[PDB]
RNA sequence: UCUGAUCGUAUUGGGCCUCUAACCUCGGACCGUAUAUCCGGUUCAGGGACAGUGCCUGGUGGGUAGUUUAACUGGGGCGGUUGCCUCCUAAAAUGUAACGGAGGCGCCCAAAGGUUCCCUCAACCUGGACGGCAAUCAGGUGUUGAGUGUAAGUGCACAAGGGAGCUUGACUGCGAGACGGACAUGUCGAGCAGGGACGAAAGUCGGGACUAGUGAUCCGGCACCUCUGAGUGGAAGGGG
RNA sequence: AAAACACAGGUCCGUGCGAAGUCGCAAGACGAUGUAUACGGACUGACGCCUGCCCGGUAGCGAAAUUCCUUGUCGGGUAAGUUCCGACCUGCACGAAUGGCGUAACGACUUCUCAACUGUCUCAACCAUAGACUCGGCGAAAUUGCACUACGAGUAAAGAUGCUCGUUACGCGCGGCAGGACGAAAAGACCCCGGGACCUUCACUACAACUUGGUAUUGGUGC
RNA sequence: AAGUCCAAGAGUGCGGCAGUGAGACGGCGGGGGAUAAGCUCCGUGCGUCGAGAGGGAAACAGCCCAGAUCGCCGGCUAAG
RNA sequence: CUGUGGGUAGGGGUGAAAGGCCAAUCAAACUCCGUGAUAGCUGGUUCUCCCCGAAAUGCAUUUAGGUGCAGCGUCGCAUG
RNA sequence: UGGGGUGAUGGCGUGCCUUUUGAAGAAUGAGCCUGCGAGUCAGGGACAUGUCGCGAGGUUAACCCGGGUGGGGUAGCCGCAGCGAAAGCGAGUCUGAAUAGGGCGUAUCCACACAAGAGUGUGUGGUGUAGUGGUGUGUUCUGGACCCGAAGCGGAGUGA
RNA sequence: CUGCUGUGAAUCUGCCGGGACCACCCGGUAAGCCUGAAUACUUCCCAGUGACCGAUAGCGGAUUAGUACCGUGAGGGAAU
RNA sequence: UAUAUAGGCGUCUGGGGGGAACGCGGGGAAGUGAAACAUCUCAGUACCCGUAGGAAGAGAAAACAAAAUGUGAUUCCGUG
């Protein structure tokens, strides 16, 4: 039985060239009128997964 | 028969973050505060929420001007 | 309501560039105000949609 | 082919009334059949283009079924609470619990945002018809009192408080550096475009005195895009 | 085992007949070889009573049998008397124009008072039998971490044979008692938490049980 | 600045493979309670027990002394 | 009241109705199978020694006796 | 120096397990003995730790042949690159109307220059980067998944 | 691609598919069609094999074994 | 009745049933997981029904592909 990858984790996380798992940031989907553009710029782009969550996110991506 | 209390906001973890003599980088937050308990001194800016941050690299110093406590950055001699 | 999330769109580029609150009671008419259209690359008049 | 009525041939989908031929009748007779309240067939009688059972479709539906019906909690229930902000508890860094002590919330402001400039009374007297605990007011000092979008720490006659102009820092769109706080949250230097003020004078000032005024993801919209386009000369069918 | 169910009587509703209603997907069946004086369902539960100016008006009656009655007051019943029985009681009341009151008979129904009777008791004594007990034969059981398993006052998971300090106690039985071994028994039924089940419903969502369109199905004319 | 000097079995980062997320009492600073509880809830580079034997507290997890590598017909002491 | 022979079968039967009875079992009988149901809950989990050695906290949680992450235990890096 | 028992008497001495803050506990389990009774196996599964082969390569799956464990089998897989949502280059790329300003990548480490003290960059040269297949053990994935235990749910039947 | 219900296409200038459509096109010729061998499994029989069990194991069954026994029955089901 | 049919009668050839697995067609759960639960999962599984054959349909492309000198009757295996 092949280890199935977690669909949600695969859709929410990516690995860079060096293997860094990257993710997008929450609170940037709607309710944006009250959010200053500095906040949305902070929430923009991709950030490396926190070391605490890295183990479980790797588990979900690999199997 | 119950209590009307029980609410409280999160502690905002205010206060001095870099004390006197600490070498800081430009843009480093020196004081998280409500209002100007400390005022921006030399090479120190004041944030929108009253956060005092270093404008230039150097060592944190606390001074007094016109009876108001201020946070200054003293430039550190290059080695 | 009361203070709807109005959308300020430019007059020239006609791009819905900004979203901001406005008290409909104090300012019932469409909020015409000078803002920056990135498509136009300059400040242009924006008005409420 | 319009400014373009007007009538006529077939078709046409409904409604009233109809007769029969579908269909129906546990109404009769006969027959298969010697046995037969079955069944089927024939015929008559009656429904008789009337009603019906499939497919589709609304509605009612504890009749039946699968389920849900939170937690905290000085047991549980009852009551109360649940998120965010402020204070005290909190033991002078930070943080710190209780169904501990108090409150706020979750909005509001296009002029209460930006900039530039300027200010100036908290209470006694003389008084100031009316107008004393108050007027429009005038002086003095009260020395920084006093009061001041909404509770603590701040801001003062170095004004974050009070007035005025601009015409829209209502400073927005691209934002190294640093940082403070697990995600989330929060701070700003600074560089560029475009502007706003102040201009002589400098070149200076990134929503609100600051912390609450909010809700992840999913899924869907709506505008724009130099993206995609399930063979494509190509488009329609997803993304940013 | 009852005050509950049923019951005979009553009322309401449904059903015009392969009725309704039920068992079935259907056919079919029961209903019923019955036909509104009959069947089914619902609810009451013999039998008797329960209308006041107009039942043209305020409008459901104001009497009575109506006992929550705590009604106290008083008595009857006991020396002290519960159940209960009476008058006085209780005010817009209060609960029944049909659901409340009566009701002979009946009752292993609930409660009480009598007469009689008695070992129920004052208050126990004695007799017999079956056990128990003794002997012979056969011969289990639950339980069991152990063991040459005391008491006191303490201490300890806060109630000690096992620990402390003392007190007592020669070893082993037999017949008895049942205070403890938080004795045995049943992984507490109570309470809480998690799950389940079944039940209810104006919780959610479904499904079984009926109407609309056109299929089956469709001809003209009087229209 | 040094000190800890055959390092603390130190701190940090990254991968270990975890369990733990019921704590208890005692001392100090407090909340609730009646400034009761062997109460309850916090703080304490505070301790101990948990997970800790040994000695003293008569017995007596949490107090006091003291952290058991093993033996010994040895010695000195801790609290008592 | 009874004998004999029959009929009604499980979300069903039967019930003068007690959730009563339906093979000593009934708020949904029993047998087999799905099946080794599932259980954040109890219980059990078996040889040794050497080194190290916790936690009972924070945040979140249909969460509070569960769990995720962090804190705290266990080899190689850098560090002296 | 020795070498086994039996234990008057004295000192000390509160079963084992589980579960707990804490049990000798009057909390759980065990009457006793013997035997049995619980982290196992599958898979090119996933993540981490010695060996073959490289030299950028490792490997084969099905399958074919072999009387075996051997020989073939390149399909594919993983390395070989990245940035982007994609179109685009290449150690570059994406965001960017703005040779304006940043993230992710160009193993790593040396030296020499130019910019820098906002703490380090930009070039230039030099070493040339190490993944992969078996089997190593520990975790983990899907399976009952360390073992035991419900009440109950469903299907098909058996019972008056 | 396909079930049911309704409505319903000509003859190659047709029709269908390429995950709409002019079509640049390509592929193929359904419904009237029908029809082949070459891969799974083992009740049974034969010959074998085992870093399988060895009488509480291994099949429930080395022995009366689906027997005794239990149950009305389905069914459960040994010991030796 | 119209017989020009259903039925009746003779004869002949076949079917009934069983079988462990495998096949095809059809009906089709719930334990369970989603840490609740209804979508979903469990799972087209268990079970059931009808039917074979030694094996079981299609089948000789209304096929795929993508501008390629493309593959070319059908099924199973490995990859993808």
């Amino acid at each position: 039985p092949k280890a199935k990858t977690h669909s949600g984790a695969s859709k929410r996380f990516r690995r860079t060239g060096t293997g860094k798992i990257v993710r997008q940031k929450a609170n940037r989907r709607h309710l944006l009128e009250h959010k200053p553009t500095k906040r949305t710029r902070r929430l923009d782009g991709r950030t490396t997964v926190s070391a605490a969550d890295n183990s479980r996110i790797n588990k979900l991506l690999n199997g | 028969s119950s209590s009307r209390n029980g609410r409280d906001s999160a502690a905002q973890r205010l206060g001095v973050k870099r004390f006197g003599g600490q070498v800081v980088k430009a843009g480093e937050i020196l004081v998280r505060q409500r209002g100007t308990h400390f005022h921006p001194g030399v090479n120190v800016g004041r944030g929108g929420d009253d956060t005092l941050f270093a404008l230039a690299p150097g060592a944190v110093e606390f001074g007094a001007k016109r009876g108001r406590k201020t946070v200054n950055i003293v430039p550190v001699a290059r080695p | 309501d009361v203070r709807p999330k109005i959308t300020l769109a430019c007059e020239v580029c006609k791009h819905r560039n900004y979203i901001t609150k406005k008290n409909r009671r104090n300012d019932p008419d469409r909020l015409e105000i000078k803002k920056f259209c990135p498509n136009c690359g300059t400040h242009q008049p924006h008005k409420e949609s």
Side-chain angles (χ1 to χ4, degrees):
Chain A
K2 289 176 177 181
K4 285 198 177 192
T5 290
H6 193 283
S7 296
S10 64
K11 296 171 187 187
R12 286 172 175 79
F13 307 105
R14 190 209 302 167
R15 283 170 176 130
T16 68
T18 48
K20 307 178 182 179
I21 307 175
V22 295
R23 59 168 191 87
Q24 304 212 330
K25 286 170 277 191
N27 293 85
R28 204 180 190 276
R29 277 281 190 266
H30 61 98
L31 295 183
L32 296 150
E33 176 266 334
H34 77 91
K35 297 177 183 163
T37 317
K38 55 177 179 181
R39 179 173 171 179
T40 66
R41 193 185 327 106
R42 174 168 63 255
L43 297 171
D44 197 327
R46 285 170 294 283
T47 57
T48 306
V49 160
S50 62
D53 297 328
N54 191 273
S55 180
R56 277 178 55 264
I57 289 160
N58 202 30
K59 291 180 184 344
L60 294 175
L61 291 174
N62 300 82
Chain B
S1 57
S2 178
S3 52
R4 254 170 59 71
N5 314 317
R7 306 159 301 285
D8 188 67
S9 66
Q12 304 306 329
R13 289 139 179 86
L14 302 174
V16 178
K17 308 299 176 181
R18 297 293 181 279
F19 292 77
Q22 297 199 234
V23 182
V24 301
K25 304 183 177 179
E28 192 145 281
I29 291 170
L30 308 175
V31 179
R32 292 291 218 185
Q33 56 170 352
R34 295 286 150 262
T36 49
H37 185 243
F38 306 99
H39 290 250
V42 177
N43 288 325
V44 173
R46 170 154 165 263
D49 61 355
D50 302 338
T51 294
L52 299 185
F53 60 97
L55 294 168
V60 182
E61 171 206 50
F62 289 80
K65 189 175 289 300
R66 70 175 277 199
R68 301 193 310 190
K69 301 164 167 125
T70 59
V71 189
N72 313 265
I73 295 292
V74 185
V76 165
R78 184 169 61 199
Chain C
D1 284 288
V2 192
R3 289 195 70 99
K5 274 142 71 142
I6 62 165
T7 305
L8 269 53
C10 182
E11 301 315 347
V12 175
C13 49
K14 288 185 178 183
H15 282 192
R16 303 171 98 251
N17 275 317
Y18 302 91
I19 187 168
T20 175
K21 293 260 199 57
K22 178 198 76 176
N23 183 312
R24 60 170 184 80
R25 186 179 295 276
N26 311 341
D27 292 317
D29 63 358
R30 295 169 65 177
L31 193 87
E32 313 187 7
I33 190 167
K34 201 80 176 299
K35 273 274 177 57
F36 176 82
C37 166
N39 180 257
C40 285
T42 181
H43 275 56
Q44 303 280 38
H46 295 48
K47 84 173 321 183
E48 177 183 324
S49 303

